[PDB]
Design an enzyme around this catalytic site. Sequence first.
Site, PDB file in Angstrom:
ATOM      1  N   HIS A   1       0.821  -1.200   0.000  1.00  0.00           N
ATOM      2  CA  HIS A   1       0.000   0.000   0.000  1.00  0.00           C
ATOM      3  C   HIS A   1       0.864   1.262   0.000  1.00  0.00           C
ATOM      4  O   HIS A   1       0.345   2.360  -0.194  1.00  0.00           O
ATOM      5  CB  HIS A   1      -0.958  -0.002   1.197  1.00  0.00           C
ATOM      6  CG  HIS A   1      -2.201   0.790   0.964  1.00  0.00           C
ATOM      7  ND1 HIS A   1      -2.221   1.972   0.257  1.00  0.00           N
ATOM      8  CD2 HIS A   1      -3.472   0.539   1.298  1.00  0.00           C
ATOM      9  CE1 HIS A   1      -3.465   2.423   0.198  1.00  0.00           C
ATOM     10  NE2 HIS A   1      -4.241   1.569   0.824  1.00  0.00           N
TER      11      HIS A   1
HETATM   12  C1  LIG Z   1     -15.723  11.535  -2.733  1.00  0.00           C
HETATM   13  C2  LIG Z   1     -16.314  10.256  -3.340  1.00  0.00           C
HETATM   14  C3  LIG Z   1     -16.362   9.168  -2.257  1.00  0.00           C
HETATM   15  C4  LIG Z   1     -17.736  10.557  -3.802  1.00  0.00           C
HETATM   16  O1  LIG Z   1     -18.297   9.413  -4.469  1.00  0.00           O
HETATM   17  P1  LIG Z   1     -19.873   9.282  -4.713  1.00  0.00           P
HETATM   18  O2  LIG Z   1     -20.219   7.850  -4.584  1.00  0.00           O
HETATM   19  O3  LIG Z   1     -20.605  10.276  -3.893  1.00  0.00           O
HETATM   20  O4  LIG Z   1     -19.994   9.697  -6.253  1.00  0.00           O
HETATM   21  P2  LIG Z   1     -19.339   9.115  -7.593  1.00  0.00           P
HETATM   22  O5  LIG Z   1     -18.242   8.193  -7.233  1.00  0.00           O
HETATM   23  O6  LIG Z   1     -19.058  10.246  -8.510  1.00  0.00           O
HETATM   24  O7  LIG Z   1     -20.535   8.238  -8.188  1.00  0.00           O
HETATM   25  C5  LIG Z   1     -20.555   7.925  -9.598  1.00  0.00           C
HETATM   26  C6  LIG Z   1     -21.536   6.814  -9.879  1.00  0.00           C
HETATM   27  O8  LIG Z   1     -21.083   5.594  -9.244  1.00  0.00           O
HETATM   28  C7  LIG Z   1     -22.132   5.056  -8.463  1.00  0.00           C
HETATM   29  N1  LIG Z   1     -21.550   4.328  -7.340  1.00  0.00           N
HETATM   30  C8  LIG Z   1     -20.837   4.854  -6.294  1.00  0.00           C
HETATM   31  N2  LIG Z   1     -20.443   3.966  -5.414  1.00  0.00           N
HETATM   32  C9  LIG Z   1     -20.932   2.769  -5.914  1.00  0.00           C
HETATM   33  C10 LIG Z   1     -20.854   1.441  -5.446  1.00  0.00           C
HETATM   34  N3  LIG Z   1     -20.235   1.082  -4.316  1.00  0.00           N
HETATM   35  N4  LIG Z   1     -21.448   0.478  -6.187  1.00  0.00           N
HETATM   36  C11 LIG Z   1     -22.075   0.829  -7.315  1.00  0.00           C
HETATM   37  N5  LIG Z   1     -22.213   2.046  -7.854  1.00  0.00           N
HETATM   38  C12 LIG Z   1     -21.616   2.976  -7.102  1.00  0.00           C
HETATM   39  C13 LIG Z   1     -22.999   6.247  -8.062  1.00  0.00           C
HETATM   40  O9  LIG Z   1     -24.324   5.848  -7.721  1.00  0.00           O
HETATM   41  C14 LIG Z   1     -22.955   7.056  -9.357  1.00  0.00           C
HETATM   42  O10 LIG Z   1     -23.987   6.524 -10.217  1.00  0.00           O
HETATM   43  P3  LIG Z   1     -24.925   7.618 -10.973  1.00  0.00           P
HETATM   44  O11 LIG Z   1     -24.079   8.163 -12.108  1.00  0.00           O
HETATM   45  O12 LIG Z   1     -26.126   6.836 -11.463  1.00  0.00           O
HETATM   46  O13 LIG Z   1     -25.284   8.669  -9.947  1.00  0.00           O
HETATM   47  C15 LIG Z   1     -15.449   9.795  -4.543  1.00  0.00           C
HETATM   48  O14 LIG Z   1     -14.182  10.436  -4.540  1.00  0.00           O
HETATM   49  C16 LIG Z   1     -15.229   8.287  -4.629  1.00  0.00           C
HETATM   50  O15 LIG Z   1     -16.127   7.547  -5.022  1.00  0.00           O
HETATM   51  N6  LIG Z   1     -14.024   7.841  -4.260  1.00  0.00           N
HETATM   52  C17 LIG Z   1     -13.659   6.430  -4.279  1.00  0.00           C
HETATM   53  C18 LIG Z   1     -12.846   6.039  -3.055  1.00  0.00           C
HETATM   54  C19 LIG Z   1     -11.525   5.396  -3.404  1.00  0.00           C
HETATM   55  O16 LIG Z   1     -10.985   5.584  -4.492  1.00  0.00           O
HETATM   56  N7  LIG Z   1     -10.990   4.630  -2.452  1.00  0.00           N
HETATM   57  C20 LIG Z   1      -9.725   3.925  -2.614  1.00  0.00           C
HETATM   58  C21 LIG Z   1      -9.809   2.489  -2.128  1.00  0.00           C
HETATM   59  S1  LIG Z   1      -8.692   2.270  -0.710  1.00  0.00           S
HETATM   60  C22 LIG Z   1      -9.205   0.698  -0.097  1.00  0.00           C
HETATM   61  O17 LIG Z   1     -10.360   0.415   0.095  1.00  0.00           O
HETATM   62  C23 LIG Z   1      -8.064  -0.250   0.152  1.00  0.00           C
HETATM   63  C24 LIG Z   1      -8.395  -1.692  -0.183  1.00  0.00           C
HETATM   64  C25 LIG Z   1      -8.663  -1.940  -1.657  1.00  0.00           C
HETATM   65  O18 LIG Z   1      -9.790  -1.619  -2.109  1.00  0.00           O
HETATM   66  O19 LIG Z   1      -7.752  -2.450  -2.341  1.00  0.00           O
END
Ligand SMILES: CC(C)(COP(=O)(O)OP(=O)(O)OC[C@H]1O[C@@H](n2cnc3c(N)ncnc32)[C@H](O)[C@@H]1OP(=O)(O)O)[C@@H](O)C(=O)NCCC(=O)NCCSC(=O)CCC(=O)O
Lengths: 249, 424
Positions: free
Chosen positions: B217
């Site tokens: 990571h």
């Molecule tokens: C700030 C946020 C959280 C805001 O996200 P939001 O969900 O509010 O909006 P969005 O992502 O723009 O959403 C776009 C579209 O995806 C959909 N959508 C969102 N989450 C979803 C899910 N879990 N399952 C299915 N669909 C999903 C929404 O409904 C939307 O559909 P519509 O178009 O129909 O509205 C953003 O930056 C994000 O999503 N970040 C992702 C976090 C990330 O990258 N984490 C790293 C993993 S670190 C981790 O977990 C370590 C372990 C590992 O995973 O390896």
Amino acid sequence: PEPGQTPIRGIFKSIAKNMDISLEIPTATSVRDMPARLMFENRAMVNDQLKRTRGGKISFTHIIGYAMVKAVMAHPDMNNSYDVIDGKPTLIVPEHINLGLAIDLPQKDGSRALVVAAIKETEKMNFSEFLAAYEDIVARSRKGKLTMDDYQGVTVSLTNPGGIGTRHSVPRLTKGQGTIIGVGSMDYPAEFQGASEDRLAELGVGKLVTITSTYDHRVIQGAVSGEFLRTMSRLLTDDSFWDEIFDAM
Amino acid sequence: PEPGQTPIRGIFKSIAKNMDISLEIPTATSVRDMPARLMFENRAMVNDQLKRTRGGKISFTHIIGYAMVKAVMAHPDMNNSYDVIDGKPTLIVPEHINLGLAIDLPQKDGSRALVVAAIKETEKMNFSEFLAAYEDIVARSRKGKLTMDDYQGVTVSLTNPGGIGTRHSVPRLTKGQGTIIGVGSMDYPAEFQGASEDRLAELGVGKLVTITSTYDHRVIQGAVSGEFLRTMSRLLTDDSFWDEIFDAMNVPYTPMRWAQDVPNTGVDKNTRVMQLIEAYRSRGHLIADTNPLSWVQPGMPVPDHRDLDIETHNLTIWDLDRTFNVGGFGGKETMTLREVLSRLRAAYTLKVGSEYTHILDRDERTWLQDRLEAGMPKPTQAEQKYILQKLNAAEAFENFLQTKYVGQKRFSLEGAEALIPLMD
Ligand SMILES: CC(C)(COP(=O)(O)OP(=O)(O)OC[C@H]1O[C@@H](n2cnc3c(N)ncnc32)[C@H](O)[C@@H]1OP(=O)(O)O)[C@@H](O)C(=O)NCCC(=O)NCCSC(=O)CCC(=O)O
Ligand SMILES: CC(C)(COP(=O)(O)OP(=O)(O)OC[C@H]1O[C@@H](n2cnc3c(N)ncnc32)[C@H](O)[C@@H]1OP(=O)(O)O)[C@@H](O)C(=O)NCCC(=O)NCCSC(=O)CCC(=O)O
């Protein structure tokens, strides 16, 4: 890509350092799959109302984020953290529930970085207030007007790898926090991805979401983490929970 | 077992030491479940081609292994590792993608050990090259002729606990690597393991595979790992990916296409099946393996043969195991689409391409139809030997004239020696 050895510097160096520090936290993970049908239906209704009003648009993370805050209030142990003060193990009980959002930021340089911005004092918000605070943090993060105070005081974190389509994950827990919640893909299981909509509708197969809870095992027990996820599952299919959101919107 | 305390020594001691070193790597895991139906179907087709060729046999690890290499190329960050050089955190970018295979080795002593042998420079291989390199490593590992160089330079690892039937796993990451990929069991979910094949086929339930990505990571972000698994999922159901494999393995048929099940509405599927039968009887010769050369004349118009695809007749892969009334085709009243396709292909798309449906007389057409669909009877060894004698005579005669009269016109039959047994 061009081979060679390049020193890590900037935000990436701080990330690398924090991950090294996180090795001292003995973590365990609980995994629970929850029905997502009602979340799809009720979110559509809310977005329909916002469309006629010409307002915004809520996402699944808003709903799950808010449900998570409610579940932490029902199970306050999940908000506690561990620390060694004066050479003695101490249980830290925070004064507020500061929800950290994992925001992926593809920079203009080319590289992408993840930051955890805090929504502070979530325990004294309704859905309307929570949504406003959520959008404020996200909006400022994109334009890059986040202060140092935004990064401090995180008590519990929420990450959403499910957007990319990851079923679930086992994330790392940062020091100074009790637990991190991971939201998986909200989709049909892989065994149903080839089935026709007619057959799925006939059988009554719903979409699911997998939620993980990675917690510090020194201060949080496995039963507490399990009950926390159970509460979240109940809330997402509760009439009262959705009535509250509908009234707010 | 015999109790007591026994010191760990040999390969096991090195394994224990490496696992202790791995404690200094902060790892996270991404888990993704992927449809495996198309992998089962297309692998079967490749193995069928290898069987006729009398070659080898590919496995799921070959396909997933190759898809993984392609995905690492699409997401190079997954190949990077972490190290502390001169007391500073450094991001190591390797020059090649060296794929480490976790090979379980049950030794003759009794104990079993796991080793990670490297397939080096996988980024500059096709499927054929990859398969050869894969088999070389595996073959040498069994006989135990692995050198020290084989164990060095691993940039990314692949492990397959799914063979035993483990759904998925969270493995440990070794120092000097960025990520390790775990392949889970390729099987129905446990909730379907009691269901009948009829009900599963009717609903259209496919098998799945669960793939995990455990990564360092400090150098790899969660989003990158997620996108990596998404790419792998796309590749395993991509037309281009499977076309590449088919071309490498020289498979003549069109790969089965990923598509959703279609309702039995409008034209009945029984109708569609019998239209498919007539299509093959009429135009099956267009795709028959009649050309000894892999040659298509530039400037010759290629005829359209979409009538031979099941998609054209509104049938899908999900209909393969469904039973249809075929009205006495193959001397049976009912048949699966799979069996219908097999019989049609065997009669009309192998070494003999027939054009007879244009014949207006039904007795003539039926006479030819019955004989063509019955197939060529297996010749006796005496008959086979006689055919060889005629082939030998044809070629040897031509070669003799070439030797004795090099500068004399003869209009040789070379390349068409089968004319002699044909006329005979
Ligand atoms: C700030 C946020 C959280 C805001 O996200 P939001 O969900 O509010 O909006 P969005 O992502 O723009 O959403 C776009 C579209 O995806 C959909 N959508 C969102 N989450 C979803 C899910 N879990 N399952 C299915 N669909 C999903 C929404 O409904 C939307 O559909 P519509 O178009 O129909 O509205 C953003 O930056 C994000 O999503 N970040 C992702 C976090 C990330 O990258 N984490 C790293 C993993 S670190 C981790 O977990 C370590 C372990 C590992 O995973 O390896
Ligand atoms: C070198 C390899 C990798 C080569 O294996 P291959 O898959 O190419 O061939 P094979 O194993 O001989 O395959 C035998 C049959 O099993 C099938 N098969 C293979 N993998 C499968 C899977 N994931 N799901 C379902 N079926 C599978 C093949 O299609 C084949 O079927 P047919 O007969 O019809 O063709 C071998 O040594 C191996 O399989 N090793 C196992 C890896 C291992 O032991 N890892 C340690 C786990 S360490 C780990 O993960 C830590 C965490 C944890 O798990 O606890």
